RNA sequence: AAGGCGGCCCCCUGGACGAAGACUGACGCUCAGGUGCGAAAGCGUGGGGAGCAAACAGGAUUAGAUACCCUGGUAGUCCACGCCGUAAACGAUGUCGACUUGGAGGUUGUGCCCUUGAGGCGUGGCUUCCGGAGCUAACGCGUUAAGUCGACCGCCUGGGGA
RNA sequence: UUCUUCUAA
C-alpha cells in the first residue's frame, strides 16, 4: 500500500519534512518497509532523503542527543 | 523512549507504557547484540538461517493447513 | 543542607550491578547507592531484588534534600531495569519522566571478542 | 509422584478432646507403632502445660504451636553452577506439620527425665517464645531473607 | 569478472539493462604459454594508533592447564607506496551457444486498458524457492540442469609416502 | 564451574 506509487513522484524531497516525519519513529529511526509498505524503489529514495534532512538539522538523529 | 507521565495517570500504567516503547524501539536486543563482536561470517550465516526459518516454516504451516490429523 | 525540590534519578543497570544516583537537573549528584553496596554479593547482587533495595538506600540518602518530584533516566540492560523504579515510586516520589538513555553507537568502536563458554 | 495428585487419608480425632490436630500430634510423637504410650505422653505433658497457664489444653497447645509455625521455607533448585535456595511459601497444612515435628524433635534433645517433662517444658517455652523449636523457626526465617533475591 | 563493495556530499570513472529506430556486415566462441586482477594473515619504508587484540604478564580453573574464563596488554588492525599471490578464493558445479512441461515470489525496466485505486493485460533483464519429464550410486539437480547437444580449455587414475 | 581413560578373539 505504498503511498509514493499512488501519488507518483519522481523523487522524494528531503525538504518536505511533514511527509518525512510520517516515516520516522518517535526516536528518529527510519521506519522499515515492512511496516509502512513502501515499495523498495522509494524506500531507497526515502532513506537517502532522511539522511540528508538529518545532516541539515531538519530531523534529529535521535530523540536523546542535545 | 522519552516518555512523559500524562496528567492524572497511575504509575503502573506509565511503567507498562515505558516497557512498551523500549520493546518497540528495540533497546534490550540492540545492546545484547553489541555485547560481543560478531564476525561477518557469523552475521551472514545467522541472517541466512533466519531467512530459511521464515520461509520453510511458511511452507510447513501451509502444508499442515491442508491435511487433517484425526 | 540546601533543599531542592525536583531531581533526576540515574540508573546504571548493568548485568553485574545496578547503580542508582539521585542528582539535580544539572548533574551535580546528591546521593547514590549501589546493589553491591546493599549487603549483596556475586549472584545475589545481580538480581532485581538487589536493585529495589538499592533504590531504597539511595532514596533514604537524599531524604534531607526535600525532593518531591523525580524524573528517571535508565541506562544499560540489567535485572534492575524495571524493579528499581517500582521501589523508587514506593519511596513516595511523584514520578515525572522515564527516559531510556542507553548508549547506542552507530557501529563505532569494535566490541570485544565472544566468550567461548 | 510423577503421574497423579493423590487423595489423602482421613485421620481420627483424639479421644480426649475431639481435636483432629492433636491426634496428628500424637502420630508424630509415636515411634514403633506404640500409639498407647504416645497417647499417654501427650496427655501427661498437656496436663501440666495447662497447669502452668490456666487455659484450655487445646487453647494453650495452639499458643506454643503458633510460635513455631514457619511462614516461608526454602528449597534447593540449582539451575546454575551452585545451589539456589529459593524461598517458597509454605501452605497452611505443611505450616502445621513442620511445627509439630520441630516441637517433638526439640523435645528429644532436652535433658529432662520424663518425655512428658521434656515436651511440656518445650511447649511452655514455645509459648514463652524460647527454646530450640523456635530457634529452628528462626534459622528457617533467617535463611529466607538471606535468599529473598531469588524468586 | 572474481576477491569484494554500506553515513552523507562533490569531482573523475567502468559496466549492465530497457525502449524504439539507424548502422557495420561474421567482425564470433574458446584459449597452452603470456599478462593483469586477487580476502585475511604476513613483509619493507614512512605515518597514525581510540577500540579490539596474537605474543606476553598476572589471576583463576584443574591431577596438570604453556588452554577455554578473567584483568591487563605489544605487533597487528588504520593510511600512503611497494612486495607476497595464497583461503572451505565454494554454487566444493570452467566458459560460450542452442533446445526441453510448470508453480509461488523478489528486484529492475517498458508497452497497453477508462490509472473510472495501490488496479487490468502484456513484454525484457536479474534473482529466490518448490517441483515434472529426464538424469544421477543415492542425496538430489531440475529452463540459472547435475536434462538433451555442440566448441574449446583445465584436470583425474587405489590409500598412504606427499 | 571443572569432570580424563579402558587392552584380549
Ligand atoms: Mg567481558
Ligand atoms: Mg549493408
Ligand atoms: Mg575468455
Ligand atoms: Mg592486509
Ligand atoms: Mg615476524
Ligand atoms: Mg606494515
Ligand atoms: Mg609502522
Ligand atoms: Mg595503544
Ligand atoms: Mg584477553
Ligand atoms: Mg590451492
Ligand atoms: Mg568468498
Ligand atoms: Mg555462498
Ligand atoms: Mg576448487
Ligand atoms: Mg528442485
Ligand atoms: Mg549423464
Ligand atoms: Mg550441462
Ligand atoms: Mg554428475
Ligand atoms: Mg593413557
UniProtKB/Swiss-Prot annotation, chain C:
GO molecular function: small ribosomal subunit rRNA binding; structural constituent of ribosome
SUPFAM superfamilies tied to this protein: Translational machinery components
GO BP terms: cytoplasmic translation; translation
Keyword tags: Methylation, Ribonucleoprotein, Ribosomal protein, RNA-binding, rRNA-binding
Remarks, miscellaneous: Has been predicted to contact the N-terminal domain of IF-3 based on footprint studies; exactly how IF-3 interacts with the 30S subunit is controversial.
Function, as annotated: Located on the platform of the 30S subunit, it bridges several disparate RNA helices of the 16S rRNA. Forms part of the Shine-Dalgarno cleft in the 70S ribosome.
Subunit structure: Part of the 30S ribosomal subunit. Interacts with proteins uS7 and bS18. Cross-links to IF-3. In stalled ribosomes contacts ribosome rescue factor SmrB.
HAMAP family: Ribosomal_uS11
Descriptive protein name: Small ribosomal subunit protein uS11
Organism in which the protein naturally occurs: Escherichia coli (strain K12)
